[PDB]
Structure 1
Amino acid sequence: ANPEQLKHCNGILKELLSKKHAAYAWPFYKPVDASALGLHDYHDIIKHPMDLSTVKRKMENRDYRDAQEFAADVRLMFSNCYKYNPPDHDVVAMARKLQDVFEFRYAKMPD
């Protein structure tokens, strides 16, 4: 069932990247460019950066062998946001909204 489940994961990924969610998904599209943002402590705090472009590359390259591996990366991305930013920052609100999209559809995985 890993291939079918991975198609569900790819569908989720496409949805997360889609225009429908862009108002809150956009901070997660590409790796955080810490230097560009003046976040000179980012890589001291976040040991394992993750973003949707990386998830997409990994999916396209058949790196993910199962849905759980995919989910762990998407959740890592959100965790990095929750770790680095104060909980009242807009980006955290954006993360929580995108994570809600993710978790509700991931829960519908065929099995």
Structure 2
Amino acid sequence: SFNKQWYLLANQIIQSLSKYEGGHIFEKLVDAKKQNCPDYYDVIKNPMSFSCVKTKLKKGQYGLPTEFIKDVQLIFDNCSLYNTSGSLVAITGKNIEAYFNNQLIVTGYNNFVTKANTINE
């Protein structure tokens, strides 16, 4: 069915991000002490990781395909907010964001978004 099909696609896409070069930095939430960033959660108020998205997909927490996109984009927006533009972490986020947005085209995922936008118009 409709929702099962884009859930399957979303799981495929999130897994490709996890395997992308340097994608491990987005897998788990930042540990303020262990990653030497004591101020992280003072700056980042809506934290998000690949593993959070996988949990929402596993549990059935998304109702619309755009909710998946919003959460993944939030990871990259957190990245560019906290990290300085030239840094290894900021580079990695820009790389994976670019990859992610291309995958939404290549997999047809955006077409589920287009179909769902007309439904809830």
Same fold flag (TM > 0.5): yes
Unmatched runs of 5 consecutive residues or more in structure 1: none
Paired residue secondary structure (1:37)? coil
Indicate the residue corresponding to 1:63 in structure 2: 61
Tell me, in whole angstroms, the C-alpha distance in 1 between the residues paired with 2:74 and 2:90.
Answer: 14
The equivalences for 1:29-108 within 5 A come to 29-107=27-105, 108=108
Structure 1 residue 5, shift from structure 2 partner: 2.1
Which range moves more in the overlay, 4-13 or 47-56?
4-13
4+ long deviations beyond 3 Å: none
Higher relative contact order (CA 8 A, sep 6+): 1
- For the aligned residues, what is the CA RMSD? 1.3
8 A Cα contact 1:85 1:92, kept in partner: yes
Corresponding letter in the other structure for 1:17? S
Identical amino acids, percent of aligned pairs: 31
8 A Cα contact 1:24 1:97, kept in partner: no
> Which is higher, the Rg of structure 1 or of structure 2?
2
Unmatched runs of 5 consecutive residues or more in structure 2: 113-121
What TM-score does the superposition give when structure 1 sets the normalisation length?
A: 0.89
Indicate the residue corresponding to 2:8 in structure 1: 7
CA shift digits 1:44-100 (9 cap, x unpaired): 100010000111111111111121001100000110000001100011111111111
Residue-pair matches, total: 108
What TM-score does the superposition give when structure 2 sets the normalisation length?
A: 0.82
